[PDB]
Amino acid sequence: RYPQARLAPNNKPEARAALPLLRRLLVARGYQEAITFSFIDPALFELFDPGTQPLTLANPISADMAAMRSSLWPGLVKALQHNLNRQQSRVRLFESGLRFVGQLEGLKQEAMLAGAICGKRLPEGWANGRDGVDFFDAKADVEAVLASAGALGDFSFV
Amino acid sequence: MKFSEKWLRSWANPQVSHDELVARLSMVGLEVDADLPVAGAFSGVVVGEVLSTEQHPDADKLRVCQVSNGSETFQVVCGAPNVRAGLKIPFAMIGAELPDDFKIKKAKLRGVESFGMLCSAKELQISEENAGLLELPADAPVGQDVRTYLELADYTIEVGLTPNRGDCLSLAGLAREVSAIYDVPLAPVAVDAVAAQHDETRPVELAAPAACPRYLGRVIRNVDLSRPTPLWMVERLRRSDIRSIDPVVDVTNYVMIELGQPMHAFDLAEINGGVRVRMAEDGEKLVLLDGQEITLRADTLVIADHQRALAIAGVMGGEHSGVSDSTRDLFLEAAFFDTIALAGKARSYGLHTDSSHRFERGVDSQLARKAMERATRLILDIVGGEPGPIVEQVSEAHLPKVAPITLRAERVTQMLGMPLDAAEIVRLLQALELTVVADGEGQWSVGVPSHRFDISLEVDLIEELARLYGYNRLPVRYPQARLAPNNKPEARAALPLLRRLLVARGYQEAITFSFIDPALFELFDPGTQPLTLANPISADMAAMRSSLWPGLVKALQHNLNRQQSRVRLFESGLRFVGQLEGLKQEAMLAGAICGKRLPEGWANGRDGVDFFDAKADVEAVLASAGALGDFSFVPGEHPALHPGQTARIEREGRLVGYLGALHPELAKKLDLEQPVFLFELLLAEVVDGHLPKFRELSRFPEVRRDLALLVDQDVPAQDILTQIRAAAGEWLTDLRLFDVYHGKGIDPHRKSLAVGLTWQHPSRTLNDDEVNSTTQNIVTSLEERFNATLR
Amino acid sequence: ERIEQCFSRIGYEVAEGPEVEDDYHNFEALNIPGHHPARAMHDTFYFNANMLLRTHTSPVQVRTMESQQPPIRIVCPGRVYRCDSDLTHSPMFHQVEGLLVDEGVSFADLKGTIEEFLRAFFEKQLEVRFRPSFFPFTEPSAEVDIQCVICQTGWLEVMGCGMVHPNVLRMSNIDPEKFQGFAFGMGAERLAMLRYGVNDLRLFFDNDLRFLGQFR
Amino acid sequence: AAERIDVTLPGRGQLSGGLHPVTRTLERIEQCFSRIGYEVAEGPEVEDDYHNFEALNIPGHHPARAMHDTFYFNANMLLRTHTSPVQVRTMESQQPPIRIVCPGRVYRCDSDLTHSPMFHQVEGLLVDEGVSFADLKGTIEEFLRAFFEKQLEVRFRPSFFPFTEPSAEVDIQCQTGWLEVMGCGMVHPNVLRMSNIDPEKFQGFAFGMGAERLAMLRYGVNDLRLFFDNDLRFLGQFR
Ligand SMILES: O=C(Nc1cccc(S(=O)(=O)N2CCN(c3ccccn3)CC2)c1)Nc1nccs1
Ligand SMILES: O=C(Nc1cccc(S(=O)(=O)N2CCN(c3ccccn3)CC2)c1)Nc1nccs1
């Protein structure tokens, strides 16, 4: 049998940029989605976040998978270099996921959107210039995301 | 349907304010479109009588009057041209407060003392008439408040009726409604029979009984048509937006608006041996009272005599058989016409009347006699005369009958979502004059009254209960559904997806009219016959589009003309191909770009858009469902496009669309100076793609080799790359064209192609010998097919 | 897109049909008879005696009723055409139409559906009012009102609805004794104008980048 | 008669990238339910032993609670072993009806080649007045047909889970001719009771499925290690 339901029409607010929307935007803008482990090496954690005490596991699967991430960057940089080591030169990755801030007492679990780019600005082709990616290329990709729900004017890069 | 509230209240008085009434009416399905007062506010103005007048001794344009208010005589100086002895007029007494804060005071006009003011309709804000004094009827009651006498404490309410409420096209109908809504007594006008003073009649024949099952006729001899329409009737008609024309037309209009029965009066002298109600002969000609010479169809019912047609039954009278100056005797008509037999007939001759509207919507099949007696009394009171006996012709077999309806209490509970008590069901239905009789437990048998042409089914009765109970008092529920999980296929690129892609790629969505100018259609599609509209709104909106390009190009130039330089537009919609027989209605996705490649900015190059920019946008769309490899861009030709810059897009041989630069010649005609790039795709051929099929990754390194090739300037790069894949072996993992050179360093009929070839073996490392062997056999292949050379 | 979402989230399927239609699907099948003024060349664009430009999206719903048996839960967004255009009305415009046909469907179900869609769409817990009206295809029929919250008693007419007339189901081989149904319609430009504060209807079809750029 | 002729050469610029196959899978599962009134629910990844075990009838001595299978921070705080705690948080926050889907990252300590220390799963929960085992069978059977785009044969085998009674392992066709793809069951009365939902008035069904498992069947992926490696040669296959 199929369960019965007295359902009413409904919808989320019009002026909101949800994660599925933003993922598809970045895809159109030439990014590839990555998925990295939440637990990372304390040595790596300390490089991207000096001074902060990671939320450490009591029974990690290994010593280099003992620290809950505070940023999606250590994992992305690591996936980017894995590719660079595998004869890839143009790497454009993005990831969404939680970050873990503080110790158990007052721990913050916040959903983040992060991206990492390297290599040439464009793919190799007859009509494309041979220039390398820079800060303003990443800025363009960020502006596009921040403008997804018609509120770009509310953001400032300082 | 406009009416005086005072008149309505005289039949049914709800005992609620005017505001409460206007509110409830709209809440019960009689929407009030307007509610306005009949006149401006004023006090101290009464009916006065002019006893005498004299010439003012020191002003020729002025008169000195002696006016009585029934209690006292006052001297009043008046300049109005119509002031004279005997006149009954509105007399503003010293004290009277007239519209827009004007207080009447004692005056001394050119030496003569005046104790009041005599009024015009304009001065009292009654009418726009300021010609002279408002001459009140000879029999007006002197001393009475003019507001009371003229019933100026009133509103006019205008109702926008739905076509199912033909019954409400009269005060009799509206009062019946008000009484049902509020459950209050209905006091209808008592209409006594007028006894015959003679035995003069005229024969009446129902030659078409189905179209007219009841016709009443009366002879009224020796009428004085010089006599005027009484003020009460004029005011009642004026408050219903009916102009006073003549006493006889005014009576027939009055009766129609009071009771709902359209009636007609003929000059008795114009009836050649009695009335014959029959269908018209084909091509029979009639001149209407308005002067229009109509040529009739055999389907149309007419009122004729023994010699000719007199009127178009239920719609309009003929000129030769109407009342005139010579008229001494009348012949009154009151009939029932079938709603079906008349439906659309007035419109087909380009006519619409208050009679036509009422009969089409339905007039009470039993009302003719009551209305006839009413009109007879009014006629004798207004113009006099001696009435003869009523002639009633009736076809019982053709009279309308609505079979009794069976209403089930279960079905009312179901629809409404709550039960209603049997007493409330009965009370409500009875108030609408429905005949309710029990027919077992929770079931009745209901009969429909002769004024309702919209009740025939059980649902019509349930509507009536819902309506009178109150729609907004009824419960609110969400419908139940036995639902199962479901989803559309994974590997498909839907239009919403593609629209969002193009937005990300910097396009703006446009919406253009489907119907365009045939001149424009012909420019983008020469020789093709457009699917043309029979009744276009204009001549330049007569052709159904075969392409979304004419509209897009037009919107692009509209923007260019409005100080815009970078224009990037896209549209989705149908195209119409062929004539009705075999017409194809296909959903398309089209885009148009012009101006700079990028927006103006410090980090952006100042280059203009070209073919390869549009191509990139097309490739992105075609790659949306992982099936880009299924598409091929082949050198093509299109009449609206540049022959040197056109690509025909195909899938398995089938035509997907076109991509190219707008033909320079077309640009000239359209007054376009900039290059513009267009693409159009059949969505039916874009949507389907392929689900990913995982292919194992090798653990071994890839090997790359670059090749510089000299080929004929006119050999397509896609042809060369296709041949390379054919000769590269199984291990080729990538083939990139990274440079095209056609300059000084080489022959002007040749071009150099720099290609990057990448290979990877799934289970081992690739040695230099095998790679060099493959590279050479690719070269040998290219020398044999295209006579290629290494740079 | 926004209207579709309100319904597609609760089991409604999006239906599409042709723009060039026949008089049967466009009028006859919806209890609009031959002599009806809506069928006149003053209001309807014709190609010949029987073929026209659809005056509403209801024919798509008719095509569904003939092709399948209940349950039916469909939304029909699309371009529709009227001959009797002016400043306040356009010869071409968009409308969405709904149709639900099942076994125990009541007027309460219709009220609930319409009331919740308006609240969802306008993102406010607004007040909804139903006034009795007349339509040839529905019985009972109603005109729906909302408060002037989105800006003459502080009410606005936004859409119509009604319980599908028995003859309409019957004509499309659906037994009125077994099944019940409700339908509705709304104008897309009308809703857009209320939502975004657009004054002139002519702006939608002009395609000025200065107007369009405001909806990024 | 001007020679501005050009060819079939590739377009200029950058083209689209793509989504991760697991993301595609999760999106696809959510859609099957969100189309029929189910709300997407999310919760924390670092959870307490109550929401993760106790509230789901997993007692103290249960082997699933051991450090061999669960990652701990201290005695009471852990990395969620399943998405069920999100469903528990919903049961406490509201009264029936409840129609939710819970996609998310979950963690297991007992990893190897065939199992990953981190993976994605989707969990469903429906709680209403007249919910039967027939309702559960119908739901599961129609979702699998929808997701796999085939009118495949579905089989239910009796199994045991601490949070459901009766519980079942679901199979679809493809060495036995059948494949185990997901689990389901009627929510155990003590589970509802603990979250202040009267088992006498309300009934409910729940289910779970592994995203990588479904992705592997759908796209023909062999090695689970490919999902977390993020090689562009793997990812580029799902554009
Ligand atoms: O029933 C409908 N639609 C419907 C229901 C109520 C109100 C409206 S509406 O407000 O858009 N309006 C009402 C006024 N309209 C009229 C009125 C008379 C004649 C023609 N048009 C236009 C549409 C649309 N469709 C069906 N399809 C299949 C079976 S029923
Ligand atoms: O009941 C569920 N979920 C459920 C139901 C049946 C099967 C599965 S499953 O196959 O994913 N699997 C079964 C085996 N699992 C076990 C078994 C024992 C201990 C821990 N884990 C992991 C999950 C999930 N959740 C609820 N939330 C709130 C109330 S009920």
UniProtKB/Swiss-Prot annotation, chain A:
Transmembrane segments: none annotated. Disulfide bonds: none annotated. Signal peptide: none annotated. It is found in: Cytoplasm. It comes from the Bacteria. Tetramer of two alpha and two beta subunits. Belongs to the phenylalanyl-tRNA synthetase beta subunit family. Type 1 subfamily. This is Phenylalanine--tRNA ligase beta subunit. It comes from Pseudomonas aeruginosa (strain ATCC 15692 / DSM 22644 / CIP 104116 / JCM 14847 / LMG 12228 / 1C / PRS 101 / PAO1). The lineage of its organism: Bacteria, Pseudomonadati, Pseudomonadota, Gammaproteobacteria, Pseudomonadales.
Curated annotation (Swiss-Prot), chain C:
GO terms for cellular component: cytoplasm. Binds 2 magnesium ions per tetramer. Its EC number is 6.1.1.20. Its cofactor is Mg(2+). Signal peptide: none annotated. Mg(2+) binds at residue 139. GO terms for biological process: phenylalanyl-tRNA aminoacylation. Keywords: Aminoacyl-tRNA synthetase, ATP-binding, Cytoplasm, Ligase, Magnesium, Metal-binding, Nucleotide-binding, Protein biosynthesis. It catalyses: tRNA(Phe) + L-phenylalanine + ATP = L-phenylalanyl-tRNA(Phe) + AMP + diphosphate + H(+). It is found in: Cytoplasm. One of its GO terms (molecular function) is phenylalanine-tRNA ligase activity. Tetramer of two alpha and two beta subunits. Belongs to the class-II aminoacyl-tRNA synthetase family. Phe-tRNA synthetase alpha subunit type 1 subfamily. This is Phenylalanine--tRNA ligase alpha subunit. The chain holds residues 114 to 338 of 338 of the full protein.
Swiss-Prot record, chain D:
One of its GO terms (biological process) is phenylalanyl-tRNA aminoacylation. GO terms for cellular component: cytoplasm. Binds 2 magnesium ions per tetramer. Mg(2+) binds at residue 165. It comes from the Bacteria. It catalyses: tRNA(Phe) + L-phenylalanine + ATP = L-phenylalanyl-tRNA(Phe) + AMP + diphosphate + H(+). Its cofactor is Mg(2+). The keyword Magnesium applies. Tetramer of two alpha and two beta subunits. This is Phenylalanine--tRNA ligase alpha subunit. The lineage of its organism: Bacteria, Pseudomonadati, Pseudomonadota, Gammaproteobacteria, Pseudomonadales. The chain holds residues 88 to 338 of 338 of the full protein.
